[PDB]
Design a protein around this ligand. Structure first.
Ligand SMILES: *[C@@H]1O[C@H](CO)[C@@H](O[C@@H]2O[C@H](CO)[C@@H](O[C@@H]3O[C@H](CO)[C@@H](O)[C@H](O)[C@H]3NC(C)=O)[C@H](O)[C@H]2NC(C)=O)[C@H](O)[C@H]1NC(C)=O
Ligand SMILES: *[C@@H]1O[C@H](CO)[C@@H](O[C@@H]2O[C@H](CO)[C@@H](O)[C@H](O)[C@H]2NC(C)=O)[C@H](O)[C@H]1NC(C)=O
Ligand SMILES: *[C@@H]1O[C@H](CO)[C@@H](O[C@@H]2O[C@H](CO)[C@@H](O)[C@H](O)[C@H]2NC(C)=O)[C@H](O)[C@H]1NC(C)=O
Ligand SMILES: *[C@@H]1O[C@H](CO)[C@@H](O)[C@H](O)[C@H]1NC(C)=O
Ligand SMILES: *[C@@H]1O[C@H](CO)[C@@H](O)[C@H](O)[C@H]1NC(C)=O
Ligand SMILES: *[C@@H]1O[C@H](CO)[C@@H](O)[C@H](O)[C@H]1NC(C)=O
Ligand SMILES: *[C@@H]1O[C@H](CO)[C@@H](O)[C@H](O)[C@H]1NC(C)=O
Ligand SMILES: *[C@@H]1O[C@H](CO)[C@@H](O)[C@H](O)[C@H]1NC(C)=O
Lengths: 145, 338, 48, 48, 48
């Protein structure tokens, strides 16, 4: 892992500015040793062009011994309303997958990743058909394609 | 895990061209951003409304912004019926911009109207739509003198097929060592060039601009290559590029609202590195002097994190917008959300 | 003790589905402990 | 890895890894494991 | 003495709640249907 990533500036090269990453972003010192660090505390220097800002970018890398079993880390994030298609667990098509005959009755609907409780009726088409959900001002579902 | 770009270019050297930035810089027909006439508005994602006005916080352009104006010229040709000789381009390829939030593009503004020809000031002809070409990346370098070339991985978006196909490929550009190529001796500029006779007035070759691109760079390991089809027309349109944690999203008006002009997403490319710089590739058009036609400019407005007031018709499209920070009356209108 | 994460409230394993689900109607404590060598509690052949 | 418009087999994911630590903010594992979502995004790395 | 009026006071909901901190304002954008109601109610009371 990278333990020091800072930008050198100055005529004497005596100004260090630590460079920090934003959430869910890579590091400018990633490309110093993409695979791994051959030795603990390994130091790399690289020159930056004028477009990036210029100076001597500096990186330091630390090495931790490998364990018997490969240990991994995962960050899982769920995004709502980012399209009209969904990610699902593999499961059989439910016999409750039709609404043509239960119009007028309260049901718990889980349609393409949007969930709620409601009563379905037949109406005339409004909104853009391409996007499959019509919402009101208060972010409540009012129409479904 | 790499798509293969097997037809590598065997060209001995890159094509010669003359860059003249002053000629293009002179032309100006400004298009300030006007919220009243819906301009560069990304339709809300995954949801629609009908007959209602609300306030949306997203990526929108600034009101009354001039943007940046780009022109595509014709090619130098010797003789009335002679074949084109060399390309006439601007210095776009040597300029590096910022992608900070994303950007929208007005395309086909001056369609259906007369205008001068850049290469020949005397000639006035009807203008045609010209799609832009972009290179987007996260790190840079120079050849030796400061000409800018993109680093390890770059997203390259090029129109081809005489304006009928769009090619987007995320892959590695290796400067070729040919004569007067970027790795060669005299590197003036890199550009895409296509002969009209080869493709347009024939079975359209959907690879001409890509082949021209391969002359300047080699496509090293080169993860993915996507292609969409574009219907041929002369309607004005909007294009847009955005990036977030899901990758690089592409928006266009042709996908859903061809006439109104609202931009709808059609592609989510897996480019998660984080794009910081972009560059417009000059796109010269090659044909005889008589066939020379002027091509419409395109305007690259820059997206900012803003709030607008959006009015949704019954059909679900947007017809009125208010920039909620332009002036006091706009803020008042958004405060009452009407 | 190597499957402690699978006994937590909200796990996605098979323990809360087919093995043991905790009821929160009352004040509760879930304690995972280790029997010392000399304490007389016979081990099973394995865990299941 | 970004997942949109697909189905995942939970039987496999239960077996291919041995979870040592859950820590969830806003969601629980048996809501990703029983609900349908517009998009998943997984950032994976090797970490001691 | 007969009182005929009160002091007319109006409030800025986005300044009283978030004292110019951009970290607070971004969380208040999720709200802001509750700020307009305060702004519109006070405008009416002062108008009357
Ligand atoms: C430049 O010239 C183009 C043709 O040379 C124009 O393209 C025309 O635009 C019209 C809209 O302004 C289209 O009308 C549409 O026709 C379809 C077909 O029946 C209807 O569904 C649509 O409702 C209708 N549009 C509206 C708003 O009612 C023409 O079909 C179209 N023709 C061609 C050949 O493309 C451009 O509009 C014109 N201006 C610009 C800025 O490009
Ligand atoms: C245009 O160029 C593309 C290169 O991206 C070609 O696609 C590849 O072509 C080679 C050569 O036949 C194949 O080996 C690859 O398998 C193709 N790529 C994929 C993803 O299939 C494309 O064939 C070219 N088209 C024309 C008309 O020349
Ligand atoms: C361009 O790249 C070069 C090397 O890739 C950078 O290095 C300097 O190049 C200039 C001439 O281009 C030389 O005069 C300097 O001596 C070089 N510096 C060193 C330390 O060797 C250069 O900084 C980059 N930028 C420009 C504008 O040339
Ligand atoms: C590109 O051309 C413009 C227009 O004259 C000029 O202002 C700019 O300095 C040029 N840039 C380079 C790098 O040549
Ligand atoms: C749309 O909303 C307005 C606002 O009240 C209303 O008067 C009108 O009846 C609605 N429908 C149409 C078709 O305009
Ligand atoms: C990116 O390109 C530069 C150009 O020299 C090279 O030094 C660097 O190693 C490349 N990055 C990677 C990760 O290979
Ligand atoms: C392309 O991939 C090969 C093998 O995966 C690797 O050796 C090579 O370095 C890669 N290209 C670049 C420019 O790194
Ligand atoms: C669990 O995974 C197995 C793979 O061996 C598969 O056959 C089974 O269908 C999965 N369970 C469900 C409910 O689909």
């Amino acid at each position: 892992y990278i333990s020091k990533c800072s930008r050198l500036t100055g005529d004497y090269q005596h100004i260090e500015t630590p460079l920090y990453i934003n959430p869910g972003e890579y590091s400018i010192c990633r490309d110093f040793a993409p695979l791994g660090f051959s030795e603990d505390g390994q130091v790399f220097k690289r020159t930056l062009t004028q477009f990036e800002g210029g100076g001597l970018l500096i990186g330091v890398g630390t090495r931790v011994p490998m364990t018997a079993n490969l240990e991994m880390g995962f960050v899982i994030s769920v995004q709502y309303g980012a399209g009209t298609d969904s990610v699902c667990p593999m499961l059989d098509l439910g016999e409750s997958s039709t609404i043509t005959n239960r119009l007028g009755k309260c049901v718990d609907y889980s349609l393409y990743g949007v969930t709620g409780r409601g009563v379905f009726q037949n109406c005339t088409a409004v909104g853009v058909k391409q996007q499959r959900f019509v919402y009101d001002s208060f972010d409540n579902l009012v129409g479904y394609y | 895990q790499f798509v293969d770009m097997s037809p590598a270019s065997n060209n001995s050297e890159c094509l010669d061209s003359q860059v003249d930035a002053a000629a293009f810089s002179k032309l100006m027909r400004p298009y300030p951003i006007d919220p009243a006439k819906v301009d560069g508005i990304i339709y809300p994602l995954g949801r629609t409304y009908s007959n209602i006005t609300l306030a949306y916080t997203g990526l929108f352009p600034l009101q009354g912004d001039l943007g940046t104006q780009y022109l595509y010229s014709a090619s130098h040709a010797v003789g009335n019926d002679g074949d084109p000789t060399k390309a006439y381009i601007s210095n776009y390829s040597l300029l590096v911009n910022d992608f900070d939030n994303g950007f929208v593009v007005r395309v086909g503004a001056a369609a259906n109207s007369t205008g001068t020809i850049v290469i020949s000031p005397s000639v006035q002809t009807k203008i045609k739509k010209a799609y832009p070409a972009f290179i987007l990346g996260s790190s840079l370098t120079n050849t030796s003198a400061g000409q800018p070339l993109y680093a390890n991985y770059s997203l390259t978006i090029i129109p081809d097929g005489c304006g009928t196909v769009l090619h987007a490929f995320y892959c590695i550009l290796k400067p070729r060592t040919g004569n007067r190529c970027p790795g060669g001796s005299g590197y003036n500029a890199y550009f895409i060039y296509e002969t009209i006779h080869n493709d347009c007035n024939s079975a359209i070759n959907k690879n001409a601009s890509l082949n021209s691109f391969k002359s300047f760079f080699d496509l090293v390991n080169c993860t993915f290559f996507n292609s969409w089809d574009i219907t041929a027309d002369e309607v004005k349109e909007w294009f847009g590029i955005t990036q977030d944690t899901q990758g690089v999203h592409l928006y266009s008006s042709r996908k859903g609202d061809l006439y109104g002009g609202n931009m709808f997403r059609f592609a989510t490319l897996p480019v998660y590195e984080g794009i910081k710089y972009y560059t417009v590739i000059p796109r010269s058009f090659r044909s005889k002097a008589n066939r020379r036609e002027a091509w419409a400019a395109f305007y690259v407005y820059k997206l900012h994190q803003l709030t607008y007031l959006l009015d949704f018709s019954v059909d679900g499209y947007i017809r009125r917008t208010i920039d909620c920070g332009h002036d006091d009356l706009s803020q008042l209108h958004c405060s009452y959300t009407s | 003790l190597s499957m402690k994460s699978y006994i937590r409230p909200g796990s996605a394993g098979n323990i809360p589905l087919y093995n043991y689900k905790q009821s929160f109607a009352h004040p509760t404590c879930r304690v995972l402990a280790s029997v010392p060598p000399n304490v007389t509690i016979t081990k099973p052949e394995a865990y299941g | 890895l970004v997942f949109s418009n697909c189905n995942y087999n939970l039987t496999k994911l239960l077996s291919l890894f041995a979870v040592d630590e859950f820590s969830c903010n806003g969601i629980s594992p048996d809501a990703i494991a029983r609900g349908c979502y517009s998009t998943l995004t997984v950032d994976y790395f090797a970490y001691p | 003495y007969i009182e005929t009026s009160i002091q007319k006071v109006t409030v800025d909901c986005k300044q009283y709640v978030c004292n110019g901190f951009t970290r607070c304002e971004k969380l208040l954008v999720e709200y802001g249907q509750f700020c307009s109601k305060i702004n519109q109610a006070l405008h009416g009371a002062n108008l009357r």
